[PDB]
Amino acid sequence: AMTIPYKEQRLPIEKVFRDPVHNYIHVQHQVILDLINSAEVQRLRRIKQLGTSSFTFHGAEHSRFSHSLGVYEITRRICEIFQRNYSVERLGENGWNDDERLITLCAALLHDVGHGPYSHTFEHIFDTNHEAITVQIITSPETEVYQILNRVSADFPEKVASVITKQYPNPQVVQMISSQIDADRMDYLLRDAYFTGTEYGTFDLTRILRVIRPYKGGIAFAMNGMHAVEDYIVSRYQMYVQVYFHPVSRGMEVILDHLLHRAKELFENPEFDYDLQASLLVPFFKGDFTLQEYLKLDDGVLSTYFTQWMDVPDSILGDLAKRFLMRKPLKSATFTNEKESAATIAYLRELIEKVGFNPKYYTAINSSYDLPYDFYRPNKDRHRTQIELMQKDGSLVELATVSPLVAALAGQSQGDERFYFPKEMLDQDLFDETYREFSSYIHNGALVLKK
Amino acid sequence: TIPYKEQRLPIEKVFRDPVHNYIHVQHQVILDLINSAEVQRLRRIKQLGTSSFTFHGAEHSRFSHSLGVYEITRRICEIFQRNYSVERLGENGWNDDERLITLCAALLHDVGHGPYSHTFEHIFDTNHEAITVQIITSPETEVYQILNRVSADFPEKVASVITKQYPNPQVVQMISSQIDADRMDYLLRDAYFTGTEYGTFDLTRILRVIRPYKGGIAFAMNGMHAVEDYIVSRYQMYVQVYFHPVSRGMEVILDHLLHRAKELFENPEFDYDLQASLLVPFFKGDFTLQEYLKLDDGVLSTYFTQWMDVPDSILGDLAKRFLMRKPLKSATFTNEKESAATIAYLRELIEKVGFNPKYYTAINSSYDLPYDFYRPRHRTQIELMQKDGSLVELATVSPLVAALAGQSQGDERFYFPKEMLDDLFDETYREFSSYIHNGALVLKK
Amino acid sequence: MTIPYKEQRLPIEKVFRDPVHNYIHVQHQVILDLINSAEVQRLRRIKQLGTSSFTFHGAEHSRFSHSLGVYEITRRICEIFQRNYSVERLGENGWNDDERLITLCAALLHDVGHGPYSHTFEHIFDTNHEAITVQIITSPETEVYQILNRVSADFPEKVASVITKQYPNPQVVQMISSQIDADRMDYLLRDAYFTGTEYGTFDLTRILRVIRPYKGGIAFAMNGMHAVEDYIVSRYQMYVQVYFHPVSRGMEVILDHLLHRAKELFENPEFDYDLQASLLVPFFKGDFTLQEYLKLDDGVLSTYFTQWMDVPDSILGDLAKRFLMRKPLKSATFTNEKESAATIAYLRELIEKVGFNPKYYTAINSSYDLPYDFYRPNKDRHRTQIELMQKDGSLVELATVSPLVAALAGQSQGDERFYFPKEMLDLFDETYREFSSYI
Amino acid sequence: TIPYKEQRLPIEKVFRDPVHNYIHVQHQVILDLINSAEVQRLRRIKQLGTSSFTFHGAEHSRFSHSLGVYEITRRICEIFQRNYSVERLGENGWNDDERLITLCAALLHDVGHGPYSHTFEHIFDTNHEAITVQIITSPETEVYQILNRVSADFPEKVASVITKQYPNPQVVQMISSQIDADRMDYLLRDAYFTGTEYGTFDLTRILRVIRPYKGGIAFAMNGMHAVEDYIVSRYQMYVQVYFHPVSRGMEVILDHLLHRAKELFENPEFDYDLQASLLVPFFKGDFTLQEYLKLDDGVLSTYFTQWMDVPDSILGDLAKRFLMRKPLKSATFTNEKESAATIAYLRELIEKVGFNPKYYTAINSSYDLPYDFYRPNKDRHRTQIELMQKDGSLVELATVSPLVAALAGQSQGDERFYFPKEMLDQGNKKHYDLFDETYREFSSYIHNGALVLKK
Ligand SMILES: Nc1nc2c(ncn2[C@H]2C[C@H](O)[C@@H](COP(=O)(O)OP(=O)(O)OP(=O)(O)O)O2)c(=O)[nH]1
Ligand SMILES: Nc1nc2c(ncn2[C@H]2C[C@H](O)[C@@H](COP(=O)(O)OP(=O)(O)OP(=O)(O)O)O2)c(=O)[nH]1
Ligand SMILES: Nc1nc2c(ncn2[C@H]2C[C@H](O)[C@@H](COP(=O)(O)OP(=O)(O)OP(=O)(O)O)O2)c(=O)[nH]1
Ligand SMILES: Nc1nc2c(ncn2[C@H]2C[C@H](O)[C@@H](COP(=O)(O)OP(=O)(O)OP(=O)(O)O)O2)c(=O)[nH]1
Ligand SMILES: Cc1cn([C@H]2C[C@H](O)[C@@H](COP(=O)(O)OP(=O)(O)OP(=O)(O)O)O2)c(=O)[nH]c1=O
Ligand SMILES: Cc1cn([C@H]2C[C@H](O)[C@@H](COP(=O)(O)OP(=O)(O)OP(=O)(O)O)O2)c(=O)[nH]c1=O
Ligand code: NI
Ligand code: NI
Ligand code: NI
Ligand code: NI
16 A cells, blocks of 8 residues: 555455446546536436437437547546557557547546536527536636646646547547547447447447557447447448438427527516516526526426416517427428528428417528538548558558448438428418418428419 | 317327437327426436445436336236237236326326425425325316316326225226336436446346236236346345435435424524525425426525625535535444444533534434335235246245345444544543544444 | 137237247137148258358247248238227228238248258259249149138139239238348348348337338338438348358358258269269159158258268268358359469469369358349349338338438449368478469 | 477467457367367257247357357466466466366367257256267267377376266366366357346356365455356356256257157058168167267258158157247146145046147246256365465355355256147137047136146
8 A cells, every 4th residue: 555646546355337328337437427416417317318309319318428438438448448448668769659538538527517407509509618628628727627637747737628528649549539430429329229228239349349540540440340330330320310310300390499499588578567487597698697697507407497487478489488398499491502491491481470379489491411420431531530441461441432231321421401380380260371371382291382 | 079088199209218218208298298397397306316426327317217117117008908908818907098108107107306305305204105196186287187187086196096096906006016117217327327227127028927916916827036136126126226324424424414494494594695586485395386386406406506705604614515516424223222322422522622413413224215115005915926826925936035025234323424433622632533444333432 | 609710819819939039929729730831840950041150150040930020020010000000990991801821821931942052952953942932832732721721712812812922912922922021031130030130220210110002012201210210221221231141151152062062972873872862862862752851950961961071972971061051161262263264273283282172162152142132223123122102191111311322322332262272371381382463 | 399298380370259259270280170070079969959049039059159159268277377377376376287188178079969958858868978988988989089199198087087987176177067068168158149148147257266275266356246146147047047947848849750760760560661770879878979070950850850741640750840930838836745746637638639649738837947047055165166365265156145144045947847838728719629628628727827726
């Protein structure tokens, strides 16, 4: 027993957290344990990983907390492997340097810490940015996370954040958390599939762990593992078109967006004279918030305020709050492009209006390209956009050049376009002719462009 | 127009479920119930309460559990109709005319649960069974309007299944018995989401041996082992998950947090605004059904977040302990009588160092918990059906089930702040420590 | 009075545990009798993948389990069709559940004519499994026929017409045989399950959620395009990684040359030795009865091989050792059959210098010859389309709307391999320490 | 050149396996053993014998099981070496010099099994452990020539691990104990192929807590529940799969079929040709290793097909019953002594309708099957699963697990009486009246799957 500095302190016994996806999360460092236990990581239990997806895939109730630990776990497994077989002691200057282990472990655990409730929707209404806030959390002395990291060394908070912002000077560390095949994507693809119940949009983590390699340029995958790397791209693409891009979840998302926007407009309007009782949102209505105010938000804050709003003297706010709480998403139809459809969309909005729906709150144009999921688009100008396969002689070849399957998927390359509207426009009074004519513009789930 | 009662969906509707793969909805009435306000609200209430603090995958809702119970129930009905109908077995067979009502009841069996049900009923004296019946039979609810639209007597009938007075024992026992769709779903779903997996017995195997008869529901003798596996899963799920001390430590905090909130609300000397409008009728002890329906898990945690800044050190700390996961630790003890003197002394030491033992200690046993154990109320027991129709008791023919019945080492725990086991309060902490060895009380005083 | 055979539903359905589908559900007496019949039972002793097990050692599943899986998938389709898309609701574009029994029987029986190592066997002895399937279904001598004849007199021929694609209900025909059918779906899933190529598994439940009858047969909902894509990708992965594997084919060549060599020394009227190959005699002669064929299974051949290891012919004895002890020939990849012709003959003579004959130790082999076909949709042939159905009932060819499926189709995966002994790569050293120049 | 014992393959050779995903081979010795004639023939022998008749997925070979056991053992040795080497725990630690012999013993543990091993040993008085040792220690085999090439004394040492005489308890217990690589693979693999998907435990959690100590192999106390799940899976596989009556019905037919063939061969008056050359040494009770090694499942089934046409009624029919799946039906009974006179009477009745009772009936119990229950003997080290406390002391599993005590206390084995199915049923719409009253008399003794003794 010696004087062990904080950065190297180990728990007397390994701590294990049951996880349905990875079986166990293994924790050996005091620092990592203290981070998991910190106020701002604990906060992630109360924020759903998949936002509105749970309305379509009702198993999708998992938290950002569990995913954060999952990412940590995969990262830990990679570090173990790198140290065992591909260390600096074995391979020299560009081998894995295990002094990088702690920072890589912290970066993995904390990568999503700045996420708020329904963050994609919250960011569009309130001009937050989960990435900026992640950095702020890590480096602002008021957080428990900072106080832990600063106890490692004085510059440790800045270093951890630089990993997340991809400015850290070791590409093996950067690319383990963020690349085209990283611990982050690997956990969420496995976890989202496990909980939605789409268990066939799933690859083999262990085979990928068998072929993952560190090198001078970052992280590559041995050539004999090409097929396992293919399965991963297959899962990635399957999860995108089947789960994340689902029209009904997006329909709920549109409601949420329009709900939060109406609230904000009401708060700012002097002619509106009722109390929204939404104290934790006030700083965001005003566009003037602190990190502390932000850290108080989670999914429950929003739904709690929505419940209180079902009684508001505003018919639109009231209805939108109802729609979100009770699951009444807007319906959608596809169109080709914004330019062509413009005239038809405008006219359908007129019809919707005439029937008593304010088009601003009850319609939207929506694309899957707008969502935070990117396709594999390997480009030799941005090295972190490629998946590299390592040949036996140590040379690298980009995945798509050797895999026709991947090249076919990377070339499927397409995001959709949708127009949203109330279902009651199609469900079937002195509005007969209006509904009849609206329906006639919808065929095979698509806008008929007659105008 | 076709009658609501008979409104079968021309195209089946399916909901992907990670446990059962799909929930199949085949009747308009069932779809309408799933879509109704008071079922939807179950999305916002966690099935397992504080268990997620121990098993972080246990974030599944009462909503997904309710759909699961409905699904297993649908599958038993389909097997009953195909293999054991009245058309074949008469009196001992299944009358599929009962399908709609059995399905509505299975879907709604938990609709009156509030947030952190067990804890909530301890503080505010609510009752989920009674509220479930209220929801089904009160005209103000979407659920009622749907059921009443079936026929005028249908709400009361549906509720009679849940009260266990519906005159069909096959219908009653499908929803509630020792082995029913409810327990089968939660064992499988809890196992699936916690990742414990001990509680994965083979459902299709039980579905293959489940039989109707004149006095309820039995299991074919050739399915004894399948039934044993279910008993084993229950045992495991109870001993490993439901009775977990850490989860119960978080429950004690929640309990004490809500009590302190109530006390402050009633405190003439308390100036601060709790901004807890939805909890107010419960603080006051005068609440309506509509007021109860507005409650969910997110309501409580939102209010706890606001409370973290309250000028009451106890309330502020208890809210922090719940939101930031700082449970009381616990140690086992055997006797309420002999450990008493020792417990009283530990409370002194805890107080000595500045924790109010009313808030920062508790006595807790797994006997208090909502779930129970199998020991052979009106019927509630497992019957094995011989090929000749006669019925045998499971425990009489399975020594394994018999052995586990007598296995109820349900503990007793004293809860206390972790700080006690880790400034010259140091001697007090050491004293306290010497009374605790390997998560168990050392009886000294 | 008593129930017609045609209509004998079991009081309690019978279940067969299957690791792929969890359960095979049997609810008709006709189906149970067929399952229990002599010619279906013999499929237990014939491997589904022949020589693949030498490369993927878990692939020891029989054709019997595959046959039951096809039956089971077919049953699930019918049950869904009846529930949601029956004639009662859709008329002419709907499913008529009176067709259930014939469809299930055909599903179950589709492969009954398969012998041991089917592809190889047909190449040497000139047999045809399709023809034999029909023989079995229509010959008074089989238990299968007796069962079907008991349903009604014309039932055997109707069942067979389903297999031969001549039956007048395209829905019945396409369920068993099309571009995505119960057959393909089971073997892809099962071959994946047993080889352990875990992905190559697609989501069957999603396919069964999107599968639709219509007047011209079987189509798939447009909103299920991605599910259908998942199927195509699995298909591609299985072909490229499993069915086309060179090591498995290296064993196929040995077996081919082993049986072909045994034919020769039986045909050769000179050298006299008891081959002991009682059950192969009719096949050497090319005149066999059906009963003679039905006695053939994997164990028969390997039992003969065990004996052939000591036949005075060193070529046959070696070949038998090689097949029994897993000693496969190696292979390399080239492009043209006319361009490479000079390169082959040179190596042939160099192998003969070692003391082994190129006629039995080399071969020309391509992936395109195997009993597996790529999805190649044509404008004229309706059999080669996967049809997607829009909500208005209009059909769209899968490849028209899926670039991924299109890009995979145009990917002309065609192998071309020359086979040679491993002993080449290592008499004295100065014989085969030369011309390894093809790496 | 590098010594054979140390020879590593240029690149790791991976074998796709549906159970363990991959089998990993690094040693030249292991690759050669896998490739050897005696290991290869395990492809031609089913692991579960007659189980495939009740669970039709169960067609996996003893070969894939052998690679599985090797793989699990390799994973354990790997864990033992990097976490519990002698360099770290000294005396209680793992000595990686033992790796190669342990892998060899794991791969070869079942090499002496012939076709339908349990039935075959009953009729022909073979012993698969004896034969395994023979294959390892006999110069005539490919397996010997590989092992002896390791070193002169290596074959004897490999054999001693299997006979459990080898001095290192860690090596012996990894391969044979109450919780070893052998049991772990077949439980998982048998579950995987039968499709009893919930008859499985978690290999990865056991691997996380498995540990060497001076007296062998133990498991960290923090992994007790995972050890529990292993016992649970073990028990459910026994009761649901291995002990299945229909599978045992087919085994009874196989047993009597082989017995009849032996008897017919021994009859001087019966001069018909059985055409079963490879079985003749076994009929005679005089076989060599080489004659045994030629035997597999395909040899037997081939002979059974010919036997369908042999002019003995009993043999022809039994051969048909085995090829065509016509198992004997069965009824349980609890006590042999009290049931004995009744069984004799039922045997008379069965005989009366034309079924020779010696071939068409049987009595067997699950106790007779090669699956032992967990019964820890407090003074017999080998019978126990040891859990290691934080203090380093060992505590037997049942001692601290009520569930395991409950399962271990419920350890029992049935008793069945087997008879032709046709004794019970009377066709579709009954017509066959000539023995009708005998069928009814017989039927009155079979009730609720059990033999009923009249009062
Ligand atoms: N209706 C409903 N569907 C749910 C729920 N949870 C998950 N789902 C799944 C099953 C549905 O088929 C799928 C799509 O949701 P909707 O039914 O609202 O959209 P869809 O376009 O199917 O509407 P429709 O078919 O016209 O009722 O989401 C729920 O609470 N209610
Ligand atoms: N510490 C901690 N444990 C968690 C969390 N989520 C799940 N768990 C699980 C891991 C362990 O199974 C179990 C242990 O909880 P604790 O660390 O609070 O209690 P314990 O007394 O076992 O450990 P301790 O001595 O308090 O560090 O809870 C979390 O966010 N923090
Ligand atoms: N050697 C061998 N491979 C097997 C066996 N069972 C399955 N396999 C699989 C493992 C490999 O994925 C694949 C390769 O088999 P081979 O070693 O015969 O072919 P390869 O071209 O690797 O020959 P090589 O060892 O490189 O000379 O076959 C077996 O019993 N022996
Ligand atoms: N009949 C039959 N069953 C099989 C086969 N392969 C697996 N099994 C399974 C499914 C059966 O429910 C189980 C029991 O076999 P049997 O049907 O021979 O015995 P059981 O006592 O069920 O006779 P039963 O037909 O119910 O009077 O074995 C097969 O080829 N034929
Ligand atoms: C689109 C899609 C849905 N689902 C799930 C999500 C939902 O919970 C459930 C129903 O989804 P739906 O989008 O409703 O799909 P459906 O074809 O079953 O019916 P329809 O579109 O006509 O309503 O199935 C998948 O698992 N995979 C998929 O690819
Ligand atoms: C007994 C048993 C059977 N099975 C499988 C084996 C068979 O393939 C299939 C049929 O089992 P059976 O032994 O036939 O039992 P059953 O209840 O399905 O019907 P019966 O007794 O009337 O025959 O189920 C299990 O998976 N688990 C079990 O415990
Ligand atoms: Ni992430
Ligand atoms: Ni419930
Ligand atoms: Ni087929
Ligand atoms: Ni074994």
